[PDB]
Design a protein around this ligand. Structure first.
Ligand SMILES: N[C@@H](Cc1c[nH]c2ccccc12)C(=O)O
Length: 241
């Protein structure tokens, strides 16, 4: 019987994908986690002492400048301090920015979706958290992360040459993708005819003329967001083995 045989193949493929999805999800979980912890450690220090001299020196420390493109403090009175330094656009107010509002609404450390950077006019992701002293919020600390860097991490693996990984929100918004044109599109825009369901274990869909298999894995330990790790696999290549 070819039905039983196809059934045996598919079940094996789905077990492999589950394994790859789990461990890739852990990786990005751990990597994002360290960044979050670092921003948190930085805010808890500023909480105790946020004099101008201290703020400057703290933000210039190598553990920060080598991890984030920019690290910064926006204060509740609107005063902004960043390292390394940058030309400043007229009218800037850190309290109006997505990283600031997101941290405040979260009541603690969180991550933004991509938003348009103030200087590069390109997409950026920020790890951010409020500065908490005596139950009060003195401002928000943020550390900037490049989309390209997140891509590289979730695509360490091949995956045996079958496909690639991307990040997508529970709402269906593509956050990070090896193909730049797909970023911040929705799953419905990319797949209008038969849209992959995030809840559903394994979905088939058609992309650039080829049948693909998609599978979604929750990413744990991201406060106040719901992000999935997605695997997108070439069906014909996978089954061929
Ligand atoms: N990425 C943050 C902070 C930031 C980075 N580079 C900047 C240059 C100018 C002003 C703010 C920034 C924002 O866009 O708000």
């Amino acid at each position: 019987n070819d039905y039983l045989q196809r059934n045996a193949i598919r079940e094996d493929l789905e077990s492999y994908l589950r394994e790859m999805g789990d461990v890739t999800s852990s990786n990005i979980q751990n990597w994002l986690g360290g960044r979050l912890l670092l921003v948190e450690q930085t805010a808890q220090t500023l909480a105790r002492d946020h004099s101008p001299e201290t703020v400057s020196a703290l933000l210039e420390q190598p553990a920060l400048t080598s991890t984030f493109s920019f690290t910064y403090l926006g204060q509740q009175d609107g005063v902004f301090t960043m390292r390394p330094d940058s030309p400043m656009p007229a009218g800037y107010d850190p309290r109006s920015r997505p990283w600031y509002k997101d941290a405040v609404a979260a009541g603690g450390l969180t991550l933004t979706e991509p938003y348009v950077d103030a200087a590069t006019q390109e997409l950026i992701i920020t790890a951010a958290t409020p500065v908490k002293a005596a139950g009060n919020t003195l401002g928000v600390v943020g550390g900037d992360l490049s989309l390209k860097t997140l891509v590289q991490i979730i695509n360490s693996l091949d995956f045996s040459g079958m496909g690639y990984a991307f990040l997508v929100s529970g709402d269906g918004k593509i956050l990070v993708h090896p193909d730049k044109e797909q970023v911040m599109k929705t799953l419905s825009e990319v797949y209008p005819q038969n849209t992959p369901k995030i809840a559903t274990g394994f979905s088939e869909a058609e992309l650039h003329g080829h049948t693909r298999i998609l599978a979604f894995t929750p990413i744990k330990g991201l406060p106040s967001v719901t992000w999935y790790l997605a695997l997108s696999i070439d069906k014909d290549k996978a089954y061929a083995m």
